[PDB]
Amino acid sequence: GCPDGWTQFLDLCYIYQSAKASWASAQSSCQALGGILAEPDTACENEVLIHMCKENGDAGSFGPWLGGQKVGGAWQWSSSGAAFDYLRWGPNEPNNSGGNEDCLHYNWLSWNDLRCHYQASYLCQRAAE
Ligand SMILES: [Ca+2]
């Protein structure tokens, strides 16, 4: 199971945090909560997280942080350092607007690259116990 108030999906537990934070601050928080920024690596995981965004009024622009980051020019999941396999980029993304969009978030319920110190809400994930 999951702690109270978290959303179970299979062997994962998710939670939406509304407080606005940089990617790094959001990560540290999720780590404090015993987990990581959410890493939707499957279609079904992404559906669950998008539904959480809708639930929390964050289905528009500047939606919540996810655990992907661009490191050395390539995108990776920050928990493992693994490259992406499954991708859910929105149209024309990642567009590197401004040349410094190095963190992953939801923008209109699709993946987008955004500057890492934009202050967005965030999704955490932890293993079910
Ligand atoms: Ca972008």
TrEMBL record:
Claim: Repressor is one of the keywords in the record: no
Coiled-coil boundaries: none
Gene3D superfamilies per UniProt: Mannose-Binding Protein A, subunit A (3.10.100.10)
Keyword check for Metal-binding: yes
PROSITE patterns: C_TYPE_LECTIN_1, C_TYPE_LECTIN_2, PROKAR_LIPOPROTEIN
GO terms of molecular function: metal ion binding
UniProt protein name: Codakine
Species of origin: Codakia orbicularis
